[PDB]
Amino acid sequence: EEVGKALEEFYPADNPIITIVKSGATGNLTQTRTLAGMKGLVTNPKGEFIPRPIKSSFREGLTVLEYFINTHGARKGLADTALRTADSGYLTRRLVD
Amino acid sequence: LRVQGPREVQIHLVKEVQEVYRAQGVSIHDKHIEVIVRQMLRRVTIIDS
Amino acid sequence: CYGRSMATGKLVDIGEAVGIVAAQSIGEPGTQLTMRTFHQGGVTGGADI
Amino acid sequence: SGRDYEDELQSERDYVAGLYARLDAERAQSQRRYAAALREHGGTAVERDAEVRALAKDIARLNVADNGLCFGRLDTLDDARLYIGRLGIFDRDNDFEPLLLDWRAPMARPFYVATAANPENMRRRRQFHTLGRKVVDFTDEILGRPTGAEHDATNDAALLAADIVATIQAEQDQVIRLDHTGVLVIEGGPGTGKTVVALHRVAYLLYTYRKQMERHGVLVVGPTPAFLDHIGRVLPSLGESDAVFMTPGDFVPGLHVTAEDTPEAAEVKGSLKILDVLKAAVADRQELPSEPIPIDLSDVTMRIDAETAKWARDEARKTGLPHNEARAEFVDVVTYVVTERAVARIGRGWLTRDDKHAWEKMRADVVGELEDHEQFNAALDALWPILTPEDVLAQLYTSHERLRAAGAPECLWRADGEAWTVSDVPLLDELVDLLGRNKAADEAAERERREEEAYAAGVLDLMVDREDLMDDEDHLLAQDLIDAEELADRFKEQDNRELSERAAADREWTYGHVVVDEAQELSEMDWRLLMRRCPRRSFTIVGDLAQRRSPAGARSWGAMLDSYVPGRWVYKSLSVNYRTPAEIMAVAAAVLAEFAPDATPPDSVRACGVAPWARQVTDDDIASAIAEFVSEEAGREGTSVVIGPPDVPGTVPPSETKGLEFDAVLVVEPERILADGPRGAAELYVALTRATQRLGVLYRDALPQALAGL
Ligand SMILES: [Mg+2]
């Protein structure tokens, strides 16, 4: 959170990266922090947080182990998104009925 | 339902569902939830005639 | 009683299937809500809010 | 109650208030973060779920810890302070120095395992008794030689302040630290403090094996929940949701008996010798009619007779299955014979032995008809009915013919058959295993599950298939990961009751540990039941044989335990009497010699000089005597009690004061206590041995031979 606040303070108002976000076009300050700030915490395959943060940012480039631990939740989301639609459709069908 | 009546229980159901949807950042007009709820309380149970 | 139609901005017309509209409006954003854990085992996740 | 004690209590209360203020601040921060994460996370779904669940877990943990935050305090030999409570609170501004230690933290280990003989670098252990966000009081124990200036409600420091003390510490440590993980029988004469040692022992055992028993639960049995009180006050995470309490009349779920049977029917009902009776009882219901029962079939005049009924019940007995389970064999054999005979009767002339597809076809028709024939079902209900334990016991007790046939003595007959005493509870439970379950079919619930699965499958079929996908690239679909059954189960209620509720409502629950206070009172059948309920054989058995009042109670631990753990159970006995004045033991030994020429009186330290006093009461002054006794002891510190038969309004019955201690104890008219049942003398002994400071007696005509000393 502190790194995100510092990133928001530092950026000029007219910078294109922050200009896109502040204009309501795309993205969040979270994505900007992950890009130029720090990636932060990532989750185990079992969903728990890994106490070691990814202090590197994609601007700087992630180390090997940081990238490997980051892959976990990245792959988990692929199945999570597919699974959520099942529950959404269940509730929708009940409501339609 | 037993204490306050059909009106108040319908209001309570709408309030609770909209509380859940508002906490999660979803905006749905109350009339849709009311349309759903109105069908939940369409029946009366009989004991004698 | 239903009142202004959200899509047209005018009073709802006779014959409009408001029920399906309400069902779709309530169901479509369901994917944004939190859900029960998809993990097969473990403790009941409903103990926490 | 010292003024400095009040000052220390106020200081501790202020410290706990500060801890609760920090807890409130943390909860407010967690709630704010949780709301923000739920609303506008802005990240990926998996990350949102992770943060939301972590915050929810933190909030739930804080809410749980809100009740009774701090258990106590430890004073280290380096003069430090360590606060033990339900949460770990640290000063983030002072290098995270611990303000409160989670009871599971390693440095909090001594609070549970330290003893006066092996102090783990601690000098004082302080317990706080809390009713909420407030400390009601605190009690301290010195891990070493006491001095008497310390304030504890149990008075252990003062009593031990009044080397023999070293041997007391060594014995208590030996009992407490025993790494037996088995059946431990702790025994001790009154005034020795077996309750304190048992509480410390159970605390140590539960702490050291918490991981192994966090799921199984702990059962507590005794006349009072005091042990559960201590467990809850030192292990709330286990006491509140995992522990269970039961009286011997409350073993059966749902049922709650309190009436007690006569001292002879209870004895027979409290011994395994009655088990053979119970079987006979369920064998007595294998009735065969005295007269043939017409089938009254639609077309044929078939009938059943004692011959075929005898053969059928003989076969069902030969099967060896329980009653409601062998019903299947009995009905099948009866149906076989009746169908053979009926088909032979219908098959006249046109059909004699056309076994293939003609004789067998008529057998099929006859069975299909008979299985739904109302009279046949009524007959099979009259013969070999389905029984519950109550259906067995009520009829057995009432008939007075079934008792004679089964070999049961007439000491236990009653017209009010369904009036249950605490002695009937174990028999009622054992009848569950003897009768068995009918093994019925739950068609309705199965149909409900089928319909839910069908709806879930329809929901899955409602989604877009892989062939029709319009997305830029192929991707996982819901149908690839979840099946109809999983989705249907996902939306069920899936009740999640607590263990303290889940186990108490299940007659067949196996507990991880069993604690038995006043265990000498349990009958052999109660021990059978408890051992059935604890296959791990992990028991903390506390009691004293010489204080027994029930007739079915234990007379020797070996006779009760050797049937289950021969030689494997460990016996520990406490020798020194210090909590009661030696003058009390002087008369207690005299009352105790009545049961053994030598018995085993404990040696008594701490003679007080304040002799017990006995008073003659005549001309309607006994009620006065007790009135001025209570009026005097009201203003003389501590707690006081009067013990006598309920015929006197102002006395607690001796049975109720079994496990308590008091400063001033008055016992009224021991002559009636002696005559109460077969164990009246024992009652007197118990009533005498509850006094720690002052003992008074009221007698009508003259002191009984044993009580002539005071
Ligand atoms: Mg696309």
Residue carrying structure tokens 């006094």: D691
Short-list D499, D493, D580, D572, CA closest to D539: D572
Phi, psi (rounded to 5 degrees) for D85:
-155, -170
Q: Closest residue of D to C36, CA-based?
A: D490
Q: What are the chain D neighbours of B20 within 8 Å (beta carbons)? A: none
> DSSP states of D593-621 as a string?
GGG-SS--PPEE----S---EEEE--SS-
H or E element at residue D698: strand D691-699
Q: Cα(D292)–Cα(D309) distance, rounded to whole angstroms?
A: 10
Residue D546, CA atoms < 13 Å, CB-side half-sphere: 22
* Strand order from edge to edge, sheet including D135-142: D89-91, D97-102, D81-85, D70-76, D122-130, D135-142
Q: Please say whether the beta carbons of D226 and D659 come within 8 A.
A: yes
Q: How many CB atoms lie within 10 A of CB D645?
A: 15
Residue D669, classed as helix, strand or coil, is coil
Q: Please say whether the beta carbons of D577 and D661 come within 8 A.
A: no
Per the rule left: phi > 0, alpha: psi between -120 and 50, beta: everything else, D348 is beta
Query: Is D608 exposed, middle or buried, given 0-12, 13-18 or 19+ CB atoms closer than 10 A?
Result: middle
Short-list D315, D320, D351, CA closest to D335: D315
Task: Kindly state the greatest CA–CA separation across chain B.
Answer: 49
Q: Please say whether the beta carbons of A57 and A38 come within 8 A.
A: yes
Q: What are the chain D neighbours of A30 within 8 Å (beta carbons)? A: 42-43
Which amino acid makes up residue D5? Y
D461 shares contact with chain A (CB less than 8 Å) = no
Q: Cα(D589)–Cα(D601) distance, rounded to whole angstroms?
A: 6
Cα torsion D467, D468, D472, D477 to 10°: value is -70
Q: Cα(D705)–Cα(D653) distance, rounded to whole angstroms?
A: 23
Between chains, do C48 and D490 touch, taking CB under 8 Å as contact? no
Short-list D615, D696, D616, CA closest to D662: D696
Which amino acid makes up residue D225? P
Give D464 Cα–ligand 1 centroid separation in angstroms. Answer: 16
From A76's Cα to the closest Cα of chain D, the distance in A is 7
Phi, psi (rounded to 5 degrees) for D476:
-65, 135
Q: How many helices (H) and strands (E) does chain D have?
A: 28, 20
Between chains, do B35 and C22 touch, taking CB under 8 Å as contact? yes
Q: Please say whether the beta carbons of D293 and D355 come within 8 A.
A: no
Between chains, do C32 and B26 touch, taking CB under 8 Å as contact? yes
Q: Please say whether the beta carbons of D61 and D89 come within 8 A.
A: no
Between chains, do D35 and B25 touch, taking CB under 8 Å as contact? no
Residue A74, CA atoms < 13 Å, CB-side half-sphere: 7
Query: Is D620 exposed, middle or buried, given 0-12, 13-18 or 19+ CB atoms closer than 10 A?
Result: exposed
Give D473 Cα–ligand 1 centroid separation in angstroms. Answer: 7
Contacts of D528 (CB under 8 A, 6+ apart): D272, D426, D430
- Kindly give the residue spans of alpha helices, DSSP state H, lying in D347-401: 360-370, 374-382, 389-399
Q: Please say whether the beta carbons of D363 and D337 come within 8 A.
A: no
Q: Cα(D420)–Cα(D411) distance, rounded to whole angstroms?
A: 15
Give A78 Cα–ligand 1 centroid separation in angstroms. Answer: 15
Between chains, do B25 and D38 touch, taking CB under 8 Å as contact? yes
D491 shares contact with chain A (CB less than 8 Å) = yes
Q: Please say whether the beta carbons of D187 and D194 come within 8 A.
A: yes
Residue D475, classed as helix, strand or coil, is coil
> DSSP states of chain A as a string?
-HHHHHHHHHS-TT-HHHHHHHTTSS--HHHHHHHHS--B--B-TTSPBPSS-B-S-TTT---HHHHHHHHHHHHHHHHHHHHHHHHHHHHHHHHH-
Q: Cα(D202)–Cα(D209) distance, rounded to whole angstroms?
A: 10
Short-list D101, D114, D163, CA closest to D141: D114
- Going by DSSP bridges, is the β-strand pair D293-294/D303-304 parallel, antiparallel, or unpaired? antiparallel
Q: What are the chain D neighbours of C44 within 8 Å (beta carbons)? A: 494, 496
Tokens representing D552 are 């079915």
CA distances from D361 to D296, D300, D339, D340, D352 (A): 22, 17, 11, 12, 13
Q: Cα(D34)–Cα(D28) distance, rounded to whole angstroms?
A: 10
Contacts of D708 (CB under 8 A, 6+ apart): none
- Going by DSSP bridges, is the β-strand pair D97-102/D89-91 parallel, antiparallel, or unpaired? antiparallel
Cα torsion D267, D270, D276, D281 to 10°: value is 90
Contacts of D479 (CB under 8 A, 6+ apart): D460, D463, D465
Which amino acid makes up residue D258? T
Residue carrying structure tokens 């030598």: D598
Q: Closest residue of C to A92, CA-based?
A: C27
Q: Cα(D87)–Cα(D71) distance, rounded to whole angstroms?
A: 10
- Going by DSSP bridges, is the β-strand pair D513-516/D539-543 parallel, antiparallel, or unpaired? parallel
- Going by DSSP bridges, is the β-strand pair D613-616/D293-294 parallel, antiparallel, or unpaired? unpaired
Contacts of D245 (CB under 8 A, 6+ apart): D219, D220, D221, D225, D228
H or E element at residue D516: strand D513-516
Phi, psi (rounded to 5 degrees) for D342:
-65, -40
Q: Cα(A6)–Cα(D349) distance, rounded to whole angstroms?
A: 107
Tokens representing A71 are 């892959």
Residue carrying structure tokens 């409600």: D153
- Kindly give the residue spans of alpha helices, DSSP state H, lying in D436-563: 443-461, 478-481, 484-490, 499-502, 524-533, 557-561
Q: What are the chain C neighbours of B28 within 8 Å (beta carbons)? A: 25-26, 29
Bridge partners (DSSP) of residue D699 are D616
Residue carrying structure tokens 């809410």: D63
Residue D233, classed as helix, strand or coil, is helix
Which one-letter DSSP state was computed for residue D465?
P
Query: What was the structure determination method?
Result: cryo-EM
Q: Closest residue of D to B27, CA-based?
A: D39
Contacts of D659 (CB under 8 A, 6+ apart): D195, D222, D223, D224, D226, D517, D518
Q: Which residues precede a break in chain D, with C-to-N distance above 2.5 Å?
A: 162
Q: Cα(D159)–Cα(D459) distance, rounded to whole angstroms?
A: 73
Q: Cα(C21)–Cα(D81) distance, rounded to whole angstroms?
A: 65
Residues of C forming the annotated binding site for Zn(2+)? 1
Q: Cα(B28)–Cα(B37) distance, rounded to whole angstroms?
A: 14
C23 shares contact with chain A (CB less than 8 Å) = yes
Q: Please say whether the beta carbons of D118 and D125 come within 8 A.
A: no
Q: What are the chain D neighbours of B25 within 8 Å (beta carbons)? A: 38-40
Q: Please say whether the beta carbons of A21 and A34 come within 8 A.
A: no
Tokens representing D212 are 């192994």
Residue of D38, D51, D52 to mutate for B, most B C-beta atoms under 10 A = D38
Residues of C forming the annotated binding site? 1
User: What is the CA angle D178-D184-D188, rounded to 5?
Assistant: 95
Short-list D273, D307, D270, D301, CA closest to D288: D307
Chains B, C: CB contacts under 8 A, how many? 32
Contacts of D466 (CB under 8 A, 6+ apart): D474, D477
C24 shares contact with chain D (CB less than 8 Å) = no
Q: Please say whether the beta carbons of D671 and D699 come within 8 A.
A: yes
A46, A79, A84: residue with CB nearest C31: A84
Tokens representing D558 are 């070996």
Between chains, do B23 and D39 touch, taking CB under 8 Å as contact? yes
Q: Please say whether the beta carbons of D237 and D531 come within 8 A.
A: no
> DSSP states of C1-49 as a string?
---B-TTTSSBPPTT--HHHHHHHHHHGGGGGS------SSSS-GGG--
D35 shares contact with chain B (CB less than 8 Å) = yes
Q: Closest residue of B to D42, CA-based?
A: B25
Give D547 Cα–ligand 1 centroid separation in angstroms. Answer: 83
User: What is the CA angle A97-B1-B4, rounded to 5?
Assistant: 140
- Going by DSSP bridges, is the β-strand pair D97-102/D81-85 parallel, antiparallel, or unpaired? parallel
Q: Please say whether the beta carbons of D487 and D480 come within 8 A.
A: no
Which amino acid makes up residue D699? Y
Residue D69, classed as helix, strand or coil, is coil
Q: What are the chain B neighbours of C20 within 8 Å (beta carbons)? A: none
Q: Cα(A10)–Cα(D474) distance, rounded to whole angstroms?
A: 41
B1 shares contact with chain C (CB less than 8 Å) = no
From A71's Cα to the closest Cα of chain C, the distance in A is 18
CA distances from A88 to A85, C32, D65, D160, D648 (A): 5, 9, 35, 69, 72
Short-list C42, D297, D39, D395, CA closest to A48: C42
Give D82-87 contacts, CB < 8 A, sequence gap 24+: D82/D107, D82/D108, D82/D111, D83/D15, D83/D19, D84/D108, D84/D111, D85/D19, D86/D236, D86/D237, D87/D23, D87/D61, D87/D62
H or E element at residue D173: helix D164-177
Residue of B16, B19, B20, B31 to mutate for C, most C C-beta atoms under 10 A = B31
User: Partners for B (CB, 8 Å, 3+ pairs)?
Assistant: C, D
Give A81 Cα–ligand 1 centroid separation in angstroms. Answer: 15
Give C12-19 contacts, CB < 8 A, sequence gap 24+: C18/B35, C19/B35
Short-list D659, D674, D698, CA closest to D579: D659
- Going by DSSP bridges, is the β-strand pair D603-604/D243-246 parallel, antiparallel, or unpaired? unpaired
Between chains, do C36 and D496 touch, taking CB under 8 Å as contact? no
- Going by DSSP bridges, is the β-strand pair D122-130/D70-76 parallel, antiparallel, or unpaired? antiparallel
Q: Please say whether the beta carbons of D522 and D542 come within 8 A.
A: no
Q: Cα(D669)–Cα(D703) distance, rounded to whole angstroms?
A: 9
Q: Cα(D576)–Cα(D164) distance, rounded to whole angstroms?
A: 8
A77 shares contact with chain C (CB less than 8 Å) = no
Residue D139, classed as helix, strand or coil, is strand
Q: How many CB atoms lie within 10 A of CB D358?
A: 14
- Angle at which helices D680-688 and D582-592 pack, to 10 degrees? 170
Residue D515, classed as helix, strand or coil, is strand
Q: Cα(D382)–Cα(D60) distance, rounded to whole angstroms?
A: 57
Q: Cα(D279)–Cα(D275) distance, rounded to whole angstroms?
A: 7
A15 shares contact with chain C (CB less than 8 Å) = no
Contacts of D41 (CB under 8 A, 6+ apart): D47, D48, D51, D52
Phi, psi (rounded to 5 degrees) for D459:
-60, -45
Residue of C18, C24, C31 to mutate for A, most A C-beta atoms under 10 A = C31
Phi, psi (rounded to 5 degrees) for A20:
-60, -45
H or E element at residue D172: helix D164-177
Residue D221, classed as helix, strand or coil, is strand
H or E element at residue B23: helix B6-23
Q: Cα(D234)–Cα(D84) distance, rounded to whole angstroms?
A: 10
Radius of gyration of chain D (CA): 34
Q: Resolution of this PDB entry, in A?
A: 3.1
Which one-letter DSSP state was computed for residue D129?
E
Tokens representing C38 are 């998809």
Which amino acid makes up residue D593? A
User: Partners for A (CB, 8 Å, 3+ pairs)?
Assistant: C, D
Q: Please say whether the beta carbons of D579 and D159 come within 8 A.
A: yes
Give D472 Cα–ligand 1 centroid separation in angstroms. Answer: 5
Residue carrying structure tokens 């304030």: D151
Give A88 Cα–ligand 1 centroid separation in angstroms. Answer: 20
Which one-letter DSSP state was computed for residue D679?
G
From D450's Cα to the closest Cα of chain A, the distance in A is 16
Tokens representing D372 are 């739904």
Short-list D142, D130, D140, CA closest to D234: D130
Which one-letter DSSP state was computed for residue D273?
G
From C42's Cα to the closest Cα of chain D, the distance in A is 13
Length of chain C, please? 49
Residue D245, classed as helix, strand or coil, is strand
Locate the DSSP E strands across D97-155.
97-102, 122-130, 135-142
Between chains, do A47 and C37 touch, taking CB under 8 Å as contact? yes
From A85's Cα to the closest Cα of chain D, the distance in A is 7
Give D457 Cα–ligand 1 centroid separation in angstroms. Answer: 28
Give D471 Cα–ligand 1 centroid separation in angstroms. Answer: 5
From A75's Cα to the closest Cα of chain C, the distance in A is 14
Tokens representing B18 are 């909209």
B40 shares contact with chain C (CB less than 8 Å) = no
Phi, psi (rounded to 5 degrees) for A75:
-75, -35
